Design a protein around this ligand. Structure first.
Ligand code: 8NB
Length: 162
């Protein structure tokens, strides 16, 4: 059961092209896992800064896993094909996944698990688009950045985990 997972690496997810991806392929890499939307007021700053972080630190082992999610103001209403094209407009080269739920019993189990990494049981629901979890090379959640935090806030924390 997902509650007992020790690492992101125990999970799998469908990429935005529909193919199952074993997330243990990220073993040895530092990852930013984020829920994205195309019609949010935060969309422009988040895509632009995620692409910038990936441009400068991918060669060092930074990977970004982006999960579309329509649960926050219905701001990701498009199909996966439409979302893939939207991300291409920002020159996204990191890893896009198929649209999921991040809250609810139908939420992707990776998200169920990340939300409980330390703490209390109440109030761990994802609050809006563009929450960011930082994942170390062993697949552990080491930081959470709320949807108010611009991605470039993360840059200063990266050296502790590379
Ligand atoms: C891109 C990259 O690998 N940079 C880099 C430089 C120096 C160190 O050692 C501190 C590390 Cl882990 C990564």
């Amino acid at each position: 059961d997902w509650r007992c997972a020790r690492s992101m690496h125990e999970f799998s997810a469908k990429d935005i092209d529909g193919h199952m991806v074993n997330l243990d392929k990220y073993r040895g890499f530092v990852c930013i896992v984020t829920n994205v939307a195309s019609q949010c007021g935060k969309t422009e700053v988040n895509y632009t800064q995620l692409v910038d972080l990936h441009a400068r630190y991918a060669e060092c082992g930074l990977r970004i896993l982006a999960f579309p999610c329509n649960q926050f103001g219905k701001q990701e209403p498009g199909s996966n094909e439409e979302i893939k094209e939207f991300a291409a407009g920002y020159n996204v080269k990191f890893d896009m996944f198929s649209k999921i739920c991040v809250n609810g019993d139908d939420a992707h189990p990776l998200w169920k698990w990340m939300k409980i990494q330390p703490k209390g049981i109440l109030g761990n629901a994802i609050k809006w688009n563009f929450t960011k979890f930082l994942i170390d090379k062993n697949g552990c959640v080491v930081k959470h950045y709320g949807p108010m935090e611009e991605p470039l806030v993360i840059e200063k924390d990266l050296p502790h985990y590379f």
